[PDB]
RNA sequence: CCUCUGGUGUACCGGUUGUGACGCCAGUCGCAUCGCCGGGUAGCUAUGUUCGGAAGGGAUAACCGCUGAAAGCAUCUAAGC
């Protein structure tokens, strides 16, 4: 699979320990750890590393495939790290980060306040947006989906949480 | 469950008709659906009183996902959450 023929690239601070099955990755972000298939192997030659699969099997190249991608994942989150930048539209709508818990006014009869995991955290410029900041991207998602449920997004008229890069379907009555 | 409101309450109290008896008056008792009629203690009881189906964990159904290759893109899935 060419995914898993290309190679990756460690930056120079980030450190990749192969423990057995448990591989880690240490970088100035943070830890991070990932598992290997049983089919799966890595070789660690210079910055680069080389996931090849341990017999030839179809399913050992998906598997080599899918390591890959993740380890990349990883080593560009404990280098950089990224952001998600939620943004809010509605008459009314508004949010506030106080500490670790992020503050939510979205229509309802009662405020939402939801307590970020460790290893997230959040800014807002101003009360219509907000920027998630973390160095794992599938958490980082996973908290952006579970803010964006609160409100999604409606046809006719846009209000709701919305996704900066989200194409947003409009119609309207009649 | 029986404090309250009621029902029943033929071993509790009273009014009264006919007849027989207790020697007689007075006073009582038997029989007449408990003779008929008015009340009513405990117990039982509803139509009376009080209480219950509150809240919370765990795994899931349809459904909605996150990250992610096979298939350089895409994709809730094949690893994983």
Redesign the pocket.
């Given at each position: 699979?060419?995914?898993?023929k290309?190679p990756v690239t460690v930056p120079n601070g980030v450190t990749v320990t192969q423990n057995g099955r448990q591989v880690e990755v240490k970088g100035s972000k943070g830890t991070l750890s990932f598992?290997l298939?049983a089919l799966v192997e890595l070789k660690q030659e210079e910055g680069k590393l080389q996931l090849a699969p341990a017999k030839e099997s179809?399913?050992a190249?998906?598997?080599?495939?899918?390591?890959?991608?993740?380890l990349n994942?990883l080593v560009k989150g404990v280098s950089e790290g990224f952001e998600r930048k939620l943004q809010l539209v509605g008459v009314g709508y508004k949010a506030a980060v106080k500490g670790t818990v992020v503050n939510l006014n979205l229509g309802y009869s009662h405020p939402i306040d939801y307590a970020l995991p460790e290893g997230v955290t959040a800014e807002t410029p101003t009360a219509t947006e907000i920027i998630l900041k973390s160095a794992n991207?599938?958490?980082?998602?996973?908290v952006?989906?579970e803010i964006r449920?609160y409100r999604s997004p409606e046809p006719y008229k846009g209000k709701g949480v919305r996704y900066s890069d989200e194409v947003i379907l409009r119609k309207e009555a009649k």
């Open positions: 699979s060419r995914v898993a290309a598992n298939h179809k399913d190249w998906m598997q080599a495939g899918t390591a890959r991608a993740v994942n991207k599938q958490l980082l998602g996973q952006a989906a449920a």
